[PDB]
Design a binder for this molecule. Structure first.
Ligand SMILES: Cc1cc(Oc2ccc(CC(=O)N3CCOCC3)cc2)ccc1C#N
Length: 188
């Protein structure tokens, strides 16, 4: 077969029922995740190869960065609750990994203020039980797959992308192989 278990993807031994159709995990501390966002735009290119309106879900993880890692999972919940993911993803990645200006929850909040989220609006969300629920959802989804590494993408709770088994001499070719694999898996 052109697509083979163990090559472009692996099959979960314990599939996860009722999972999101396309589920990505990342950390703002994760170096390949930085590439996946700013250099490769993996999520956008996957979406462009899937049918219109299909659910893509993207969740932050706790297991990198200690205290701040957990603050970032909560901030991602705020971003999802307010719908401002596209406004804060790049400045959070660059503040953690490029300028290293994010050292505290207050620095995370500054990114949202600078992106135009009002202070009262950010603080109300940060402390909301709706956001507590979104944090729990992010934790539960990672726990469902005993997630120990990012970037990770899961398709229908059954298949895990294997980018290590793709060619990376050409960055566009890699993105295309990755997106085409998600499409193939989604059609299984
Ligand atoms: C073109 C390109 C390809 C890449 O392939 C990748 C190689 C490995 C991973 C997995 C990984 O790192 N994990 C998962 C579990 O273990 C802990 C961390 C992801 C992508 C990476 C970067 C770039 C660029 N630019």
């Amino acid at each position: 077969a052109q697509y083979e278990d163990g090559k472009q993807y692996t099959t979960l031994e314990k599939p996860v029922a009722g999972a999101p159709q396309v589920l990505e995990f990342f950390s703002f501390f994760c170096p390949h995740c930085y590439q996946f966002e700013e250099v490769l735009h993996i999520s956008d290119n996957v979406k462009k190869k899937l049918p219109e309106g299909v659910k893509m879900t993207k969740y932050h993880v706790n297991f990198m960065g200690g205290d701040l890692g957990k603050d970032l999972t909560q901030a991602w919940a705020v971003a999802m609750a307010l719908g401002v993911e596209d406004k804060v993803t790049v400045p959070l990645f660059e503040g953690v990994q490029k300028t290293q200006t994010i050292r505290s929850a207050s620095d995370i909040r500054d990114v949202f203020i600078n992106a135009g989220i009002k202070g009262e609006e950010y603080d109300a969300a940060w402390n909301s039980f709706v956001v507590k629920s979104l944090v729990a959802q992010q934790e539960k989804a990672a726990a469902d797959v005993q997630l120990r590494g990012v970037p990770a993408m899961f398709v229908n709770g059954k298949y895990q992308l294997n980018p290590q088994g793709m060619d990376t001499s050409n960055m566009d070719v890699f993105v295309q192989q990755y997106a085409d694999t998600v499409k193939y898996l989604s059609e299984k």
